Amino acid sequence: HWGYGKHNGPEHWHKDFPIAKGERQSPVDIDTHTAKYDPSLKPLSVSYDQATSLRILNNGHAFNVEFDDSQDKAVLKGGPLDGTYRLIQFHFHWGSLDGQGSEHTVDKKKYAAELHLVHWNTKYGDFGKAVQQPDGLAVLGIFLKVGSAKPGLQKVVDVLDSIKTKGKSADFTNFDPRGLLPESLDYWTYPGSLTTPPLLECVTWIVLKEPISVSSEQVLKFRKLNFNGEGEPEELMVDNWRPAQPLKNRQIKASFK
Numbered sequence: 170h171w172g173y174g175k176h177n178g179p180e181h182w183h184k185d186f187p188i189a190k191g192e193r194q195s196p197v198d199i200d201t202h203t204a205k206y207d208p209s210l211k212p213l214s215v216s217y218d219q220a221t222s223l224r225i226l227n228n229g230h231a232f233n234v235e236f237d238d239s240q241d242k243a244v245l246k247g248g249p250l251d252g253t254y255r256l257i258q259f260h261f262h263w264g265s266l267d268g269q270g271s272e273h274t275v276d277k278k279k280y281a282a283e284l285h286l287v288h289w290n291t292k293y294g295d296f297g298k299a300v301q302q303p304d305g306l307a308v309l310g311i312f313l314k315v316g317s318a319k320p321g322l323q324k325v326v327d328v329l330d331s332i333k334t335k336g337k338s339a340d341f342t343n344f345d346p347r348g349l350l351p352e353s354l355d356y357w358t359y360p361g362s363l364t365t366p367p368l369l370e371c372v373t374w375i376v377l378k379e380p381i382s383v384s385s386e387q388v389l390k391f392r393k394l395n396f397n398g399e400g401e402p403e404e405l406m407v408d409n410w411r412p413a414q415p416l417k418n419r420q421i422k423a424s425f426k
């Protein structure tokens with residue numbers, strides 16, 4: 170099916186997912202000079218103290234660290250958000266080289282990777298109903314640059330060997346996502362979509378300005394994962410990112426000046 174190869178990559182998605190050429194597609198380039206400070210934005214609130222991770226899964230496109238969202242534990246609110254958004258999972262997008270990998274770009278600058286913490290609007294009951302609403306999801310995006318190692322990411326890195334191929338999963342409890350956040354919560358926000366099929370336009374994007382630093386060794390291990398399933402020819406899981414899409418009739422707002 171869809172993927173990131175020459176014959177099933179981003180340029181092919183529109184054939185089965187026409188919304189790929191929609192009016193609010195993601196990711197987008199963040200023109201820092203065109204972005205405008207928005208005083209109407211409320212303080213951003215990331216409350217991950219009671220987060221309960223459960224499992225990590227290689228879905229053949231990336232790997233998801235899943236959380237128990239049956240109760241209001243890890244939640245995101247404030248900022249441009251109305252109501253409470255519950256954390257369901259996080260994953261990354263990365264490249265084959267340090268010079269590429271992120272989906273969103275800043276003044277056309279591409280980072281080595283990008284972390285996506287996915288949340289759904291609790292006023293819709295569950296994730297399924299949420300993705301049928303224009304404000305159903307909120308994704309917190311964080312850029313990754315190569316430099317010093319990120320201590321809080323190591324536990325994720327060391328379990329990847331157990332989920333090398335598509336379909337494989339492993340227990341992953343007691344992981345604290347607070348260890349993946351940068352110091353500052355300054356951010357840019359705009360209305361967008363899922364960056365992979367089905368590309369649903371139900372997302373409020375909140376992209377942090379400050380990137381986190383991860384070591385070359387850590388990202389190198391991300392690149393050892395496979396897109397393929399067990400027993401199939403090896404196709405390294407790299408460059409699983411979608412390029413910037415037309416901003417069209419949208420404005421990116423900044424939480425700072």
Ligand SMILES: NS(=O)(=O)c1ccc2c(c1)CCC2
Binds near residue numbers: 178181183186366
């Ligand atoms: N349109 S899409 O979802 O990218 C897609 C789905 C299946 C297949 C191709 C492209 C090419 C080979 C088979």
Ligand SMILES: NS(=O)(=O)c1ccc2c(c1)CCC2
Binds near residue numbers: 366
């Ligand atoms: N890359 S993204 O926009 O964060 C994204 C793309 C697809 C899906 C989710 C999040 C949640 C379930 C399906």
Ligand SMILES: [Cl-]
Binds near residue numbers: 174175404
């Ligand atoms: Cl390939």
Ligand SMILES: [Zn+2]
Binds near residue numbers: 364
């Ligand atoms: Zn993503």
